[PDB]
């Protein structure tokens, strides 16, 4: 549900339930941002749909993990400026169990640290 | 001095005549109807960018500043004449484009190249209407 920050007092949770059913169509997804109001602003999202470029069976196992992270869902409003509440906008292409869907990265525009939200899941059957 | 336009293909019919000295206020015998400016810009700008696809050391990138105006000219034949219909036709304009000018040619001859020059200043700004600052490409594998 929740993961804490590394730099600020910001915490990220998803108001909609982290196990959810959908077909290959569109779906609504909703994220909590609660922080301290000393600089309550300037975060950005991006989903980063590219392959992390990376034993031979593990050598084709890490690639097939990454080639379904970066090909499964697509975020239909990336670079979303946040200002608390935001409804992030995805559609998924191919089906499976996308537990800890880990592409999406928010980032603080001052002192750029790659904050990750490795939470939530989506079955597509 | 006109004012701004968006990315549409509009037209201009300017009010004031220029000087255009001749014998008298008789007919000019060849009046332009479609002036068509910015139909030079789409054979400037594609020869700009298709020599920007190798690294730039060409003569077209050698201290040139004729892209600030892209000033065309209107040539004619044998007094003062009110301005024609422009059909400015802006669709492919760079973001550094901010001005235009029109060095009109006032012809009269028997067997001679006896002409003059008549120049107009034009300031125009741009409505930056919509932009696509990024693209990315995703393949697919599911049959829906």
mmCIF file of C-alpha atoms in Angstrom:
data_model
loop_
_atom_site.group_PDB
_atom_site.id
_atom_site.type_symbol
_atom_site.label_atom_id
_atom_site.label_comp_id
_atom_site.label_asym_id
_atom_site.label_seq_id
_atom_site.Cartn_x
_atom_site.Cartn_y
_atom_site.Cartn_z
ATOM 1 C CA UNK A 1 0.000 0.000 0.000
ATOM 2 C CA UNK A 2 2.403 2.663 1.267
ATOM 3 C CA UNK A 3 6.080 3.308 0.628
ATOM 4 C CA UNK A 4 7.895 6.141 2.352
ATOM 5 C CA UNK A 5 10.178 8.678 0.702
ATOM 6 C CA UNK A 6 13.918 9.196 0.701
ATOM 7 C CA UNK A 7 14.132 13.021 0.669
ATOM 8 C CA UNK A 8 10.850 14.629 1.772
ATOM 9 C CA UNK A 9 7.898 13.743 4.012
ATOM 10 C CA UNK A 10 5.989 12.447 0.977
ATOM 11 C CA UNK A 11 4.174 9.116 1.046
ATOM 12 C CA UNK A 12 2.482 7.336 -1.832
ATOM 13 C CA UNK A 13 -0.571 5.094 -1.635
ATOM 14 C CA UNK A 14 -3.295 4.127 -4.075
ATOM 15 C CA UNK A 15 -6.878 4.943 -3.077
ATOM 16 C CA UNK A 16 -8.265 2.390 -5.507
ATOM 17 C CA UNK A 17 -7.592 -1.188 -4.431
ATOM 18 C CA UNK A 18 -4.242 -2.596 -5.482
ATOM 19 C CA UNK A 19 -5.738 -5.840 -6.842
ATOM 20 C CA UNK A 20 -8.216 -5.001 -9.598
ATOM 21 C CA UNK A 21 -9.853 -6.591 -12.629
ATOM 22 C CA UNK A 22 -9.915 -5.153 -16.170
ATOM 23 C CA UNK A 23 -9.952 -6.388 -19.786
ATOM 24 C CA UNK A 24 -7.539 -4.865 -22.353
ATOM 25 C CA UNK A 25 -9.621 -1.639 -22.324
ATOM 26 C CA UNK A 26 -9.277 1.576 -20.354
ATOM 27 C CA UNK A 27 -9.287 1.894 -16.553
ATOM 28 C CA UNK A 28 -9.057 4.617 -13.904
ATOM 29 C CA UNK A 29 -6.219 4.614 -11.379
ATOM 30 C CA UNK A 30 -5.819 7.016 -8.460
ATOM 31 C CA UNK A 31 -2.757 7.915 -6.377
ATOM 32 C CA UNK A 32 -2.266 9.513 -2.946
ATOM 33 C CA UNK A 33 0.352 12.206 -2.402
ATOM 34 C CA UNK A 34 0.572 13.415 1.211
ATOM 35 C CA UNK A 35 3.682 15.338 2.279
ATOM 36 C CA UNK A 36 4.720 18.334 4.325
ATOM 37 C CA UNK A 37 3.605 21.643 2.826
ATOM 38 C CA UNK A 38 7.139 23.006 2.943
ATOM 39 C CA UNK A 39 7.473 22.910 -0.892
ATOM 40 C CA UNK A 40 4.211 20.953 -1.485
ATOM 41 C CA UNK A 41 4.689 20.833 -5.248
ATOM 42 C CA UNK A 42 6.933 20.079 -8.318
ATOM 43 C CA UNK A 43 6.907 16.337 -8.849
ATOM 44 C CA UNK A 44 6.665 14.724 -12.281
ATOM 45 C CA UNK A 45 5.645 11.265 -13.462
ATOM 46 C CA UNK A 46 6.937 9.285 -16.405
ATOM 47 C CA UNK A 47 6.432 5.609 -17.143
ATOM 48 C CA UNK A 48 9.715 5.059 -19.122
ATOM 49 C CA UNK A 49 8.624 2.577 -21.788
ATOM 50 C CA UNK A 50 12.032 1.332 -22.853
ATOM 51 C CA UNK A 51 13.848 -1.922 -22.202
ATOM 52 C CA UNK A 52 16.380 -2.004 -19.419
ATOM 53 C CA UNK A 53 19.144 -3.456 -21.579
ATOM 54 C CA UNK A 54 20.619 -6.080 -19.095
ATOM 55 C CA UNK A 55 23.870 -17.901 -16.986
ATOM 56 C CA UNK A 56 21.858 -18.010 -20.201
ATOM 57 C CA UNK A 57 18.372 -18.900 -19.029
ATOM 58 C CA UNK A 58 18.529 -16.048 -16.514
ATOM 59 C CA UNK A 59 19.949 -13.958 -19.371
ATOM 60 C CA UNK A 60 16.700 -14.579 -21.244
ATOM 61 C CA UNK A 61 14.656 -14.370 -18.055
ATOM 62 C CA UNK A 62 15.595 -10.824 -17.018
ATOM 63 C CA UNK A 63 14.996 -9.672 -20.599
ATOM 64 C CA UNK A 64 11.555 -11.277 -20.708
ATOM 65 C CA UNK A 65 10.731 -9.650 -17.407
ATOM 66 C CA UNK A 66 11.771 -6.248 -18.773
ATOM 67 C CA UNK A 67 10.091 -6.757 -22.164
ATOM 68 C CA UNK A 68 6.721 -7.168 -20.481
ATOM 69 C CA UNK A 69 7.262 -4.358 -17.966
ATOM 70 C CA UNK A 70 8.007 -1.923 -20.780
ATOM 71 C CA UNK A 71 5.413 -3.237 -23.230
ATOM 72 C CA UNK A 72 2.377 -4.087 -21.119
ATOM 73 C CA UNK A 73 0.738 -0.871 -20.008
ATOM 74 C CA UNK A 74 1.129 2.638 -21.384
ATOM 75 C CA UNK A 75 0.471 5.807 -19.398
ATOM 76 C CA UNK A 76 -1.831 8.071 -21.364
ATOM 77 C CA UNK A 77 -0.909 11.232 -19.468
ATOM 78 C CA UNK A 78 2.782 11.124 -18.768
ATOM 79 C CA UNK A 79 4.696 14.201 -17.517
ATOM 80 C CA UNK A 80 1.677 14.985 -15.340
ATOM 81 C CA UNK A 81 2.370 18.002 -13.179
ATOM 82 C CA UNK A 82 0.751 17.251 -9.827
ATOM 83 C CA UNK A 83 -0.557 20.575 -8.465
ATOM 84 C CA UNK A 84 -3.042 16.615 -3.548
ATOM 85 C CA UNK A 85 -5.179 14.246 -5.578
ATOM 86 C CA UNK A 86 -4.372 13.035 -9.090
ATOM 87 C CA UNK A 87 -6.030 10.424 -11.308
ATOM 88 C CA UNK A 88 -3.259 8.838 -13.368
ATOM 89 C CA UNK A 89 -4.294 7.625 -16.739
ATOM 90 C CA UNK A 90 -3.286 4.195 -18.076
ATOM 91 C CA UNK A 91 -4.327 1.672 -20.679
ATOM 92 C CA UNK A 92 -2.802 -1.813 -20.836
ATOM 93 C CA UNK A 93 -1.978 -3.677 -24.032
ATOM 94 C CA UNK A 94 -1.050 -7.268 -23.190
ATOM 95 C CA UNK A 95 -2.327 -9.383 -20.360
ATOM 96 C CA UNK A 96 -0.914 -11.019 -17.257
ATOM 97 C CA UNK A 97 -0.231 -10.327 -13.592
ATOM 98 C CA UNK A 98 1.521 -6.969 -13.334
ATOM 99 C CA UNK A 99 2.240 -7.133 -9.638
ATOM 100 C CA UNK A 100 4.530 -4.286 -8.524
ATOM 101 C CA UNK A 101 4.132 -2.547 -11.886
ATOM 102 C CA UNK A 102 7.423 -0.787 -11.616
ATOM 103 C CA UNK A 103 7.943 1.389 -14.674
ATOM 104 C CA UNK A 104 6.369 4.567 -13.325
ATOM 105 C CA UNK A 105 8.682 7.050 -11.647
ATOM 106 C CA UNK A 106 7.815 10.297 -9.955
ATOM 107 C CA UNK A 107 10.676 12.727 -9.434
ATOM 108 C CA UNK A 108 11.330 15.904 -7.449
ATOM 109 C CA UNK A 109 12.467 18.587 -9.906
ATOM 110 C CA UNK A 110 14.765 20.131 -7.322
ATOM 111 C CA UNK A 111 17.537 17.659 -6.313
ATOM 112 C CA UNK A 112 16.677 14.958 -8.840
ATOM 113 C CA UNK A 113 16.292 11.552 -7.183
ATOM 114 C CA UNK A 114 14.700 8.635 -9.024
ATOM 115 C CA UNK A 115 11.743 8.027 -6.737
ATOM 116 C CA UNK A 116 9.894 4.826 -7.593
ATOM 117 C CA UNK A 117 6.419 3.602 -6.759
ATOM 118 C CA UNK A 118 6.765 -0.168 -6.868
ATOM 119 C CA UNK A 119 3.252 -0.874 -5.620
ATOM 120 C CA UNK A 120 -0.075 -2.006 -6.984
ATOM 121 C CA UNK A 121 -1.077 -4.778 -9.350
ATOM 122 C CA UNK A 122 -3.378 -5.425 -12.289
ATOM 123 C CA UNK A 123 -4.669 -8.684 -13.649
ATOM 124 C CA UNK A 124 -5.960 -8.229 -17.186
ATOM 125 C CA UNK A 125 -8.260 -11.244 -17.358
ATOM 126 C CA UNK B 1 1.924 47.432 -40.234
ATOM 127 C CA UNK B 2 -0.463 44.515 -39.715
ATOM 128 C CA UNK B 3 -0.791 42.194 -36.715
ATOM 129 C CA UNK B 4 -0.548 38.553 -35.671
ATOM 130 C CA UNK B 5 -2.000 35.367 -37.127
ATOM 131 C CA UNK B 6 -2.307 31.752 -36.000
ATOM 132 C CA UNK B 7 -1.191 28.695 -38.027
ATOM 133 C CA UNK B 8 -4.084 29.190 -40.537
ATOM 134 C CA UNK B 9 -3.723 30.168 -44.203
ATOM 135 C CA UNK B 10 -5.253 33.641 -43.975
ATOM 136 C CA UNK B 11 -5.039 36.628 -46.341
ATOM 137 C CA UNK B 12 -4.296 40.353 -46.195
ATOM 138 C CA UNK B 13 -5.763 43.267 -48.170
ATOM 139 C CA UNK B 14 -3.863 46.286 -46.877
ATOM 140 C CA UNK B 15 -5.398 49.739 -46.995
ATOM 141 C CA UNK B 16 -2.825 52.367 -47.944
ATOM 142 C CA UNK B 17 -1.321 52.766 -51.388
ATOM 143 C CA UNK B 18 2.388 53.267 -51.948
ATOM 144 C CA UNK B 19 3.839 56.071 -54.078
ATOM 145 C CA UNK B 20 4.446 54.288 -57.448
ATOM 146 C CA UNK B 21 5.336 57.333 -59.516
ATOM 147 C CA UNK B 22 4.485 57.218 -63.223
ATOM 148 C CA UNK B 23 2.873 59.588 -65.742
ATOM 149 C CA UNK B 24 -0.490 59.989 -63.974
ATOM 150 C CA UNK B 25 -3.314 58.039 -62.275
ATOM 151 C CA UNK B 26 -3.947 55.864 -65.363
ATOM 152 C CA UNK B 27 -4.273 52.084 -65.189
ATOM 153 C CA UNK B 28 -1.210 50.031 -64.265
ATOM 154 C CA UNK B 29 -2.191 47.378 -66.904
ATOM 155 C CA UNK B 30 -1.042 44.336 -64.829
ATOM 156 C CA UNK B 31 -2.415 44.071 -61.290
ATOM 157 C CA UNK B 32 -1.455 41.163 -59.055
ATOM 158 C CA UNK B 33 -4.342 39.251 -57.484
ATOM 159 C CA UNK B 34 -2.794 36.323 -55.590
ATOM 160 C CA UNK B 35 0.395 37.766 -54.144
ATOM 161 C CA UNK B 36 1.215 34.457 -52.346
ATOM 162 C CA UNK B 37 3.891 35.146 -49.718
ATOM 163 C CA UNK B 38 5.400 32.260 -47.705
ATOM 164 C CA UNK B 39 5.578 30.032 -50.768
ATOM 165 C CA UNK B 40 9.307 30.757 -50.759
ATOM 166 C CA UNK B 41 9.624 29.517 -47.179
ATOM 167 C CA UNK B 42 8.859 25.873 -48.071
ATOM 168 C CA UNK B 43 11.755 25.738 -50.502
ATOM 169 C CA UNK B 44 13.973 27.584 -48.097
ATOM 170 C CA UNK B 45 13.248 25.510 -45.005
ATOM 171 C CA UNK B 46 13.410 22.024 -46.454
ATOM 172 C CA UNK B 47 16.782 22.885 -48.113
ATOM 173 C CA UNK B 48 17.714 24.161 -44.667
ATOM 174 C CA UNK B 49 16.877 20.964 -42.823
ATOM 175 C CA UNK B 50 17.969 18.447 -45.448
ATOM 176 C CA UNK B 51 21.450 19.930 -45.261
ATOM 177 C CA UNK B 52 21.049 19.984 -41.501
ATOM 178 C CA UNK B 53 20.866 16.191 -41.660
ATOM 179 C CA UNK B 54 24.667 16.091 -42.206
ATOM 180 C CA UNK B 55 26.688 18.406 -39.908
ATOM 181 C CA UNK B 56 26.400 22.051 -40.856
ATOM 182 C CA UNK B 57 29.299 23.596 -42.754
ATOM 183 C CA UNK B 58 27.511 24.604 -45.958
ATOM 184 C CA UNK B 59 27.083 27.962 -47.637
ATOM 185 C CA UNK B 60 23.398 27.942 -46.633
ATOM 186 C CA UNK B 61 24.652 27.905 -43.049
ATOM 187 C CA UNK B 62 27.209 30.668 -43.687
ATOM 188 C CA UNK B 63 26.088 33.796 -41.741
ATOM 189 C CA UNK B 64 22.718 33.983 -43.497
ATOM 190 C CA UNK B 65 19.921 36.026 -41.958
ATOM 191 C CA UNK B 66 17.356 36.082 -44.764
ATOM 192 C CA UNK B 67 15.108 33.825 -42.654
ATOM 193 C CA UNK B 68 14.256 36.734 -40.350
ATOM 194 C CA UNK B 69 12.162 38.291 -43.118
ATOM 195 C CA UNK B 70 11.883 35.785 -46.008
ATOM 196 C CA UNK B 71 11.036 38.929 -47.968
ATOM 197 C CA UNK B 72 9.500 38.132 -51.344
ATOM 198 C CA UNK B 73 8.971 40.568 -54.208
ATOM 199 C CA UNK B 74 6.054 41.506 -56.461
ATOM 200 C CA UNK B 75 6.891 42.281 -60.091
ATOM 201 C CA UNK B 76 4.562 44.083 -62.470
ATOM 202 C CA UNK B 77 4.324 46.022 -65.758
ATOM 203 C CA UNK B 78 3.774 49.600 -66.999
ATOM 204 C CA UNK B 79 0.065 56.130 -60.272
ATOM 205 C CA UNK B 80 -0.588 54.932 -56.709
ATOM 206 C CA UNK B 81 -2.205 51.515 -56.293
ATOM 207 C CA UNK B 82 -4.030 50.071 -53.290
ATOM 208 C CA UNK B 83 -2.669 46.790 -51.981
ATOM 209 C CA UNK B 84 -3.748 43.447 -53.404
ATOM 210 C CA UNK B 85 -4.919 40.200 -51.807
ATOM 211 C CA UNK B 86 -2.036 38.459 -50.056
ATOM 212 C CA UNK B 87 -3.045 34.855 -49.149
ATOM 213 C CA UNK B 88 -0.227 34.755 -46.598
ATOM 214 C CA UNK B 89 -0.573 30.948 -46.186
ATOM 215 C CA UNK B 90 1.365 30.386 -42.965
ATOM 216 C CA UNK B 91 1.628 26.706 -42.035
ATOM 217 C CA UNK B 92 5.392 26.000 -42.184
ATOM 218 C CA UNK B 93 7.015 28.834 -40.257
ATOM 219 C CA UNK B 94 10.008 28.659 -37.966
ATOM 220 C CA UNK B 95 9.785 30.079 -34.464
ATOM 221 C CA UNK B 96 12.403 32.739 -35.273
ATOM 222 C CA UNK B 97 10.131 34.198 -37.966
ATOM 223 C CA UNK B 98 9.002 37.648 -36.839
ATOM 224 C CA UNK B 99 8.960 40.045 -39.806
ATOM 225 C CA UNK B 100 8.314 40.406 -43.515
ATOM 226 C CA UNK B 101 8.936 42.969 -46.242
ATOM 227 C CA UNK B 102 7.875 43.529 -49.845
ATOM 228 C CA UNK B 103 10.278 45.159 -52.305
ATOM 229 C CA UNK B 104 7.733 45.889 -55.023
ATOM 230 C CA UNK B 105 9.010 46.353 -58.576
ATOM 231 C CA UNK B 106 7.495 49.300 -60.489
ATOM 232 C CA UNK B 107 8.053 48.542 -64.175
ATOM 233 C CA UNK B 108 7.820 50.771 -67.278
ATOM 234 C CA UNK B 109 9.626 50.158 -70.559
ATOM 235 C CA UNK B 110 9.922 50.652 -74.285
ATOM 236 C CA UNK B 111 12.983 48.442 -74.812
ATOM 237 C CA UNK B 112 14.671 48.836 -71.434
ATOM 238 C CA UNK B 113 15.042 47.460 -67.921
ATOM 239 C CA UNK B 114 13.873 50.729 -66.345
ATOM 240 C CA UNK B 115 12.457 49.916 -62.923
ATOM 241 C CA UNK B 116 12.527 51.174 -59.337
ATOM 242 C CA UNK B 117 12.073 49.754 -55.828
ATOM 243 C CA UNK B 118 9.166 50.207 -53.400
ATOM 244 C CA UNK B 119 9.582 48.652 -49.948
ATOM 245 C CA UNK B 120 7.100 48.018 -47.133
ATOM 246 C CA UNK B 121 7.755 47.123 -43.477
ATOM 247 C CA UNK B 122 5.621 44.400 -41.905
ATOM 248 C CA UNK B 123 5.680 43.195 -38.320
ATOM 249 C CA UNK B 124 3.738 40.069 -37.370
ATOM 250 C CA UNK B 125 3.918 37.771 -34.357
ATOM 251 C CA UNK B 126 2.828 34.171 -33.937
ATOM 252 C CA UNK B 127 0.149 32.284 -32.087
ATOM 253 C CA UNK B 128 1.975 29.175 -30.890
ATOM 254 C CA UNK B 129 -1.260 27.201 -30.954
ATOM 255 C CA UNK B 130 -0.475 23.488 -30.416
ATOM 256 C CA UNK B 131 2.812 21.607 -30.051
ATOM 257 C CA UNK B 132 3.883 17.953 -30.028
ATOM 258 C CA UNK B 133 7.103 18.048 -27.967
ATOM 259 C CA UNK B 134 7.635 14.264 -27.815
ATOM 260 C CA UNK B 135 6.905 10.946 -29.446
ATOM 261 C CA UNK B 136 7.650 7.316 -28.639
ATOM 262 C CA UNK B 137 6.874 3.994 -30.351
ATOM 263 C CA UNK B 138 5.371 0.880 -28.728
ATOM 264 C CA UNK B 139 4.722 -2.439 -30.518
ATOM 265 C CA UNK B 140 1.944 -4.845 -29.562
ATOM 266 C CA UNK B 141 1.218 -8.567 -29.413
ATOM 267 C CA UNK B 142 -2.369 -9.223 -28.219
ATOM 268 C CA UNK B 143 -5.326 -10.001 -30.493
ATOM 269 C CA UNK B 144 -8.334 -8.226 -29.043
#
